[PDB]
Amino acid sequence: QPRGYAGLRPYEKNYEGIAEADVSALQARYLDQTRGRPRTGDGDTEPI
Amino acid sequence: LLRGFESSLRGSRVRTQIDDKSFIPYTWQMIDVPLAAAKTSFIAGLDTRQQLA
Amino acid sequence: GGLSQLVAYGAQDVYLTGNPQITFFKTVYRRYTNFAIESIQQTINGSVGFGNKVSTQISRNGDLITDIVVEFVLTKGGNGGTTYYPAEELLQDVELEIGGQRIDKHYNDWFRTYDALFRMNDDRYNYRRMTDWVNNELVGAQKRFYVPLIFFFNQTPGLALPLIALQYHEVKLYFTLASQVQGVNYNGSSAIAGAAQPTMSVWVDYIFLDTQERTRFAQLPHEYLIEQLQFTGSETATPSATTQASQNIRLNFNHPTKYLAWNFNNPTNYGQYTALANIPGACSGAGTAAATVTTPDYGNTGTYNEQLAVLDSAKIQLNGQDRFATRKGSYFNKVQPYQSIGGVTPAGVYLYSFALKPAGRQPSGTCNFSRIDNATLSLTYKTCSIDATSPAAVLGNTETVTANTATLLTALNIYAKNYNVLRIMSGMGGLAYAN
Amino acid sequence: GGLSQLVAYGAQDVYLTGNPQITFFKTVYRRYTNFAIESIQQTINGSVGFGNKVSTQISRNGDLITDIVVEFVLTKGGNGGTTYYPAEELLQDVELEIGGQRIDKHYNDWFRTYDALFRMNDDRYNYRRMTDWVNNELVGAQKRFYVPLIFFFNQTPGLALPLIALQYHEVKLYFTLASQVQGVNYNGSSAIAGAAQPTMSVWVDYIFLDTQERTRFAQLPHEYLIEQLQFTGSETATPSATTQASQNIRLNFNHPTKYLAWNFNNPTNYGQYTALANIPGACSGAGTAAATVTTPDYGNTGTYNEQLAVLDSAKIQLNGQDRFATRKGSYFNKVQPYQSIGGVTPAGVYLYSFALKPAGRQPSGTCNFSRIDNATLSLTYKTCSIDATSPAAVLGNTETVTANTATLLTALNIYAKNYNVLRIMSGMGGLAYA
C-alpha cells in the first residue's frame, strides 16, 4: 500500500462522560447559623 | 528629607556623559565569523598573454 | 538617536533600571492545560411563552460550565422606537440552583442596572444589539435575541462550575418570562393583537478537559469564591412639586458586600429610570405638537439627562451612623462609576462601592452586612416642579428640581452584590453561608 | 463535539500545553488586608470665587488618601453650545504641597491635554458629563461638576499617600480659580451680567486601615515611585499665511521622563487647539450664513479634523543629536496615541512617548533629562493659506496647509511627565530628587 497512515482522523479510547447520579443526593446544609437578633439574642428572662 | 535630597545640579548634565563613551558596544552585532580575502591572481585570472611554446 | 537616551544614565535611573528584574521584550507564555469548549443546547421543561415559568437542568456533557446564553425569537408588534431591550425585559428573572439549593438570582431590571453600570463602550452597544432592534427594523420584523447570563460562573473561566465534581447533584436554571414586553406583545398598557409567543432555547458553554485535569476536578474538593445578588423591591417616597420627599430604608442585606446599586423607575416602562419630558428623546413625540410626557420614546428610554433623575442626595448609615458624608445623587450616578468601574452610568441609576474595583472578580474591600445591625439607605428626593412639556423649564433649571412627570418613578430597586463560597465536596455541594 | 478537538493533539501542541503550568478554570484569589474607604469633605480656606486663590488642608481622618474630587457649582450664562468643559476651565490650577515642599502641580490646560490624550471611550464621556453640560441645557441651568484630580495618588491606590506615615507633615492643595469661565460668566471677551459665583467643595477619599497594616505604614520607611508633571509656557512661532513658521525650544525639563506632550492654542478660548472654520462644528454658526470664524462653537471647540491643526512636523534633539527622524504632526496626533495609549487624540494635541506604555503606572522606558544639556523640541508649522470662511477651501485642501484663522493659536504649552521618589520616613516626607 503506497500511503502510510498519516495519523489524521484520530480517536480517544474509553471516553466516559461526566458522572451523573440518578439518586439525586440531598442538598448540603449550610455552615453559618441564622442571623437572629443581633443585640437581644437568646431571650431576656424577666423576673417577678 | 528636606535638605539631603539630591538635586540635578550642574556637573551632572555635562556632555561627557554621552560624548566620552562610544556607541560601539550598543549598536554592533556579535560576529565570531572570520572575514574572507583572496589573491588578485584568483579573481582576475592568469593573464593568457604569456609565451607560446 | 535612541542610543543617546540609553547612554546618558544617571542617579535617577537607578530607581527605574538599576539591578533590573524584568524585561519587556521577551514574553514567556505559561503553558496551559489541554481543553476544548462547546456550546450545547439544553432541553427546556415547561412551556415557553409570555408570563410563563420554565426551567432547565444543565446536561452533563462536558466537565465544566461557563457562559450561558438564552436565545429568544421575538417579533416587532410596532415600528422602530417601540421596543427597548425587549429580550432583556422578557427574561423577567433567572434563578440558579445546585442540589436543590438556591445559589443566586437575577432580575430583568438587574440586567438593565448591571448593564447601565458595568458594561461600556462597544461592549454595551454589542450587548444592546443582542437584546433589541437597533437598525430601525419595522413592524413584523423577526429577530433572534441572545441574553447572556450574569451568574458568577458566566463571567470568568476562573469560576467554571465543576459539574464534573457534582456527581450527586443536579444544576438548574429557572427562568421567568415577563407577562408583557413593550413593543413585542404590548404597547404601553395595550395588548397587541396577533402578537406571537417567543421561541426560546438555552445554550450552555461547556469545557472539555483532558485526562489529568478531569481527574483532579472529579476527585478533589473545591471552594469557589462566588458572587451573589441580593435584591428587594421597595416603594419610593415619591417626590412632589410641593416637597422634597425623604426616605430611610433599612437595608436587609448580609454577607461581605462589594457594592450597592439602585434605581428609581416607572413600574410600567421597562428601563425608565428618569422622568419624561418634551425634549428630544425624552418622551413620545418630544419636540413636536403631538409630544406627550406621559409616555416615553421607548427606543430612547435611557438618558444621561440628570435633570430628569429624582435623587437629590443620599447617604448610607451603618448601625445608625453615617458611613460617609451625604452626597448628591449625581455623585452616585457619575463619580462612583467613574472611580469604581470606568464607564458611564445613565441618569436615574446609582452606585455605591465598598470596594476599590467591584467590577472585577478579586475582592478589593467589602462591607460585611452580617456584622452590621442597622444599615440604612437614606434618600432625599428632588422637587417635582418642572413643567415637563416646556424645554425652557426642563433644560434651563436648577440642581434641586426635576420634572412633574418624575412622580411616575414610584418603584425603587435596591441591589447588593456580595461574596459567598460555593463548596463542592465528594460529588455534592452548596453554599457556606446563608446570611 | 468538544472531544474532537481534545484528541487533535500532537508535537505542535507541546509548546502550548505540555507539562502544563496553569489553567484557566480555577482561580486563586489572594487574601488582602482589611480596610474601608470613606468620602470626607475638606474645609476650603480662603474665599471661593472667580479669579480667587483658595486652599485646603487634608484632615487626618483616615490613614491613606487617594481620589480627590473637587466639586463646583456653576450656572449657564448662555444657551447650549456656549460652554466647553467649564469646570476644567475654572480649576485654573492645583498645587500639591507635602511638608512645605512642592511635589507637583496641574493646570486647567493640562487637565484638557491629559484628557485629550489619556481618557477614552465612556471614561471620557462620563468624564465630560462631570465637567460640562452635555444634554442641551439652557441659560440659567445649574449643575454640580466633579473634577477629579490627577496627581499620582489620585490615580491608583498603589500610590495612596500614607498620611499616617506623614504625622509631622501637612498635605495641602492650593487652587487657583479662573477669572473667567466661558459660557458661565463670560462669552468670549464679554462679561455675562447676572452670572453666579461658584460654589466649591473638595472631597478626599480616605482609606482606613486595620491595625497591622496601619502600624506598618506608620512605622516603616517608604519609597513611593510617583509621577510628576513639568510644565512651561512658550510663545508660539505664530503660523503665517505666507510661509512655514519654525521654532526650536530648549526644554527646561528634568528627571526620567515617560513622555512629552504639547499643544498650540488660542489662550482666549479654553480647549481651542485648532483653527476656526466655516465647516460644521469648527466655528460658531459654522456651515451657515451666520458663521463666524472669529469665535468657536464652544460646545464643539475640540475636533479631530487635522486640517485645522498647525503642526506640520516635529523632532526632539538631544545635545545636538536627533532623537528620532522628523515626523509629521499627524504622527504625534494619531500614531503615538494609537501605539502608546489606545485612545483618540483631538487635532492640535501632540504626544511623544519615551515609554512603551506611558498611560500606565509601571515604568516602561524613560528619557532622563537630568542628564541632557540641550533637550530641544523642533517644530515646523503649516502655512495658513486657507480661507476659513469657505468650507470648500478647508475640506478640499492639502497636507501642508491650514486655515488663515490658525494664526490665532499663539500660545504654546509644553508638558512633560516624569518619575521621582517620594520618600517617607519617621513621620515625614519629601522628594529624593529635585
| CB proximity list for A44: less than 8 A, separation 6 or greater | none
Sequence-ordered alpha helix ranges (H) in D28-165: 86-90, 108-118, 121-129
Amino acid at C156: T
Which residues of chain D have a CB within 8 Å of the CB of C338?
123, 126-127, 130, 146, 148
The answer to whether the CB atoms of C305 and D25 lie below 8 A apart is no
C182's grid cell = 413593550
* Cβ(C52)–Cβ(C45) below 8 Å: no
Residue C69 sits at φ, ψ, to 5 deg, of: -125, 125
Q: Which residue has the cell 413592524?
A: C139
CA distances from C184 to C197, C201, D137 (A): 9, 18, 34
Cβ atoms of D412 and D262 within 8 Å: the answer is yes
**Facing residue for D319 by CB, picked from B5, B7, B18:** B18
Dig out the grid coordinates for C395 from the structure: 433644560
Euclidean distance between CA atoms C353 and C336, whole angstroms: 7
Residue D369 · residue D254 · CB < 8 Å: yes
Task: For cell 491595625, name the residue.
Answer: D211
Cβ-Cβ contacts under 8 Å for C143 (sequence gap 6 or more): C73, C74, C75, C133, C137
Q: Is the dihedral of CA C6, C7, C8, C13 positive or negative?
A: positive
d(CA D232, CA D329): 20
Phi then psi dihedrals of residue D352, to 5 deg:
-135, 115
Contact call for residues D280 and D271 (beta carbons, < 8 A):
no
Q: If we measure between CA atoms, which residue out of C332, C270, C333 comes closest to residue C107?
A: C270
Backbone angles phi, psi at D285, to 5 degrees: 75, 10
DSSP three-state, residue D21 = coil
D311 bridge partner residues? D381
CB D256 within 8 A of CB D367: yes
CB D274 within 8 A of CB D116: no
Q: What is the distance between the alpha carbons of residues C290 and C295, in angstroms, rounded to a whole number?
A: 11
The C-alpha atoms of residue D417 and residue D261 are separated, in whole angstroms, by 8
CA distance A41 to chain C (A): 12
The helix or strand, by DSSP H or E, that contains position D401, with its residue range, turns out to be: strand D401-403
Give the closest of B6, B12, B21 to C7, CB-based.
Answer: B21
DSSP structure class, residue C12: G
User: Which grid coordinates belong to D290?
Assistant: 451666520
If one counts every other C-beta atom within 10 angstroms of the C-beta of residue C37, the result is 16
d(CA C89, CA C86): 5
Question: Amino acid identity, residue C120?
Answer: M
Residue D260 to residue C296: CA distance in whole angstroms: 49
Helix %, strand %, coil % for chain D, to 5?
A: 20, 35, 45
Type of residue numbered C358: P
Contact C193, C88 (CB under 8 A): no
Which chain C residues are closer than 8 Å to B21 by Cβ?
Answer: 7
Element (H, E) at C391: helix C391-395
Cβ C301 vs Cβ C270: under 8 Å: yes
Residues D127 and D112 sit within 8 Å (Cβ to Cβ): no
Q: In C210-273, which ranges are continuous DSSP H helix?
A: 211-219
Round to whole Å and give the CA distance between C31 and C237.
Answer: 57
Cβ contacts of A15 on chain D, cutoff 8 Å: 3
Q: How buried is residue C194: exposed, middle or buried, by Cβ count under 10 Å (0-12/13-18/19+)?
A: exposed
β-pair type (C401-403, C383-386): parallel
Report how far residue D115's alpha carbon sits from residue C335's, in angstroms, rounded to the nearest whole number: 16
Q: Are D281 and D293 in contact (CB under 8 A)?
A: no
Residue B28 to residues B22, C23, C63, C369, D324, Cα–Cα distance (Å):
11, 21, 54, 65, 19
- Name the phi and psi angles at D70, rounded to 5: -100, 120
Residue D392 phi, psi (nearest 5): -65, -40
Tell me the residue type at D243.
T
Q: Which residues of A8-46 are buried (b: 16+ CB within 10 A; e: fewer)?
A: eeeeeeeeeebebeeeebebbeeeeeeeeeeeeeeeeee
Chain C residue at shortest CA distance from D321: C1
Structure-solving method: cryo-EM
Dist. CA D290–CA D284, nearest whole Å: 8
Smallest CA–CA distance, residue D397 to chain A, in Å, is 60
**β-sheet with C101-107: strand ranges across:** C44-45, C53-57, C171-177, C91-98, C101-107
Is C166 in contact with C428 (CB distance < 8 Å)?
A: yes
- Nearest C-alpha neighbor of D279 from the set D291, D264, D267: D291
Q: Which of B7, B17, B18 sits opposite D434 (nearest CB)?
A: B7
In this structure, the strands spanning C246-250 and C375-381 are antiparallel
Report the greatest alpha carbon distance in chain D.
79
Torsion sign across C-alpha atoms B21, B27, B33, B39: negative
CA separation (Å) from C353 to C358, D131, D203?
7, 22, 16
User: Regarding beta strands D383-386 and D401-403, do their DSSP bridges make them parallel or antiparallel, or are they unpaired?
Assistant: parallel
Helix (H, G, I), strand (E, B) or coil at C171: strand
Phi-psi region of C45 (alpha: psi -120 to 50; beta: other; left: phi over 0): beta
The three three-digit cell numbers of residue C129, written as one number: 444589539
Grid coordinates belonging to C288:
413636536
Let me know: does C43 contact C107? Beta carbons within 8 Å: no
- Cα separation, C304 vs C338, whole angstroms: 14
Range list of β-strands (E), D99-194: 101-107, 142-148, 171-177, 186-187, 190-191
Number of other residues whose CB lies within 10 A of the CB of residue D282: 28
Q: How many CB pairs under 8 A join C and D?
A: 218
Q: Are strands C142-148 and C190-191 parallel, antiparallel or unpaired?
A: unpaired
For D271, the grid coordinates are: 480647549
Cβ burial of C358 (10 Å; 0-12, 13-18, 19+) is buried
Q: What is the CA radius of gyration of chain B?
A: 29
Query: Minimal CA–CA distance to C359: which of C375, C376, C338, C377?
Result: C338
| Contact by Cβ (8 Å): D128, D134 | yes
Q: Where are the alpha helices (DSSP H) in chain B?
A: 16-19, 24-27, 40-43
* DSSP helix/strand/coil, D404: helix
Cβ contacts (< 8 Å) between C3 and chain B: which residues?
23, 26-27
The contact set of A with D (CB < 8 A) is: 7, 10-12, 15
What's the CA gap between C295 and C283, in Å, rounded? 6
Contact D138, D76 (CB under 8 A): yes
Q: In this structure, how many other beta carbons lie within 10 angstroms of the beta carbon of residue D298? A: 24
Q: Say whether residue D33 is in contact with chain B using an 8 A CB cutoff.
A: no
Residues 6+ positions from D182 with CB-CB distance below 8 Å: D82, D83, D84, D86, D89, D188, D269, D270, D298
Alpha-carbon distance values, D44 to A47, D147, D149, D201 (Å)? 57, 15, 16, 7
D184 in Cβ contact with D79 (< 8 Å)? no
Please report the DSSP string for C392-416 in residue order. HHHHS--TTEEEGGGGG--EEEEEE
- At C327, is the secondary structure helix, strand, or coil? strand
Cell of B37: 580575502
Angle made by CA atoms D158, D164, D170, in degrees to the nearest 5: 100
Dihedral Cα B23, B26, B29, B30, nearest 10 deg: 100
Bridge-based pairing state of the strands D190-191 and D186-187: antiparallel
Cα separation, C212 vs C164, whole angstroms: 13
DSSP-H helix ranges across D220-316:
none
D193, three cell numbers: 451680567
Chain D residues inside the 8 Å CB shell of B1: 99, 423, 425, 428-430
The CA distances from residue C20 to C15, C17, C39, C413, D364, in Å, are 9, 5, 46, 52, 12
Beta-carbon contacts of residue D10 (< 8 Å; ≥ 6 apart)? A7
Distance, in Å, from the CA atom of D32 to the CA atom of C225, rounded to the nearest integer, reads 14
Query: What does the alpha-carbon distance between residue D258 and residue D240 come to, in Å, rounded to a whole number?
Result: 33
CA distance C188 to D251: 65
Contacts of C375 (CB under 8 A, 6+ apart): C250, C251, C253, C316, C317, C318, C319, C369
For residues D200 and D70, what is the distance between their CA atoms, to the nearest angstrom? Answer: 7
Distance CA D383, CA D392 (A): 17
Under a CB-based contact definition with an 8 Å cutoff, are residues C200 and C145 in contact?
A: no
Residue type for C163, please? Answer: L
- Cell 428573572 -> residue: C93
Radius of gyration of chain D from its Cα atoms, rounded to whole angstroms: 24
Going by the DSSP 8-state scheme, the letter that residue A41 receives in this structure is: -
Q: How far is A12 from chain D (nearest CA, A)?
A: 6
Q: What is the C-alpha R_g of chain A?
A: 31
User: Quick one: CA dihedral D292, D296, D299, D300, positive or negative?
Assistant: positive
Which of chain A's residues have a Cβ under 8 Å away from the Cβ of C60? 17-20
Q: Which three cell numbers stand for residue C343?
A: 464607564
Please classify residue D156 by burial: count the beta carbons closer than 10 Å to its beta carbon, then call 0-12 exposed, 13-18 middle and 19+ buried.
Answer: middle
- How far apart CA D264 and CA D237 sit, in angstroms, is 10
User: In angstroms, rounded to a whole number, what is the distance separating the alpha carbons of residues D1 and D323?
Assistant: 56
**How distant, in Å, are the alpha carbons of C423, D167, D330, D415 from that of D324?**
58, 47, 16, 19
- Kind and range of the H or E run holding C199: strand C199-209
Distance CA D138, CA D77 (A): 9
Residue type, C332: F
Collect contacts of D211-220 with beta carbons under 8 A, ≥24 apart. D212/D33, D213/D33, D213/D34, D213/D35, D214/D63, D214/D164, D217/D63, D217/D64, D217/D162, D217/D164, D217/D165, D218/D63, D218/D164, D218/D165, D218/D167, D220/D165
Interchain pair D430, B2: CB under 8 A? yes
Residues C229 and C111: beta-carbon distance below 8 Å: no
Residues contacting residue B52 through CB under 8 Å, at least 6 positions apart: none
C211 three-state secondary structure: helix
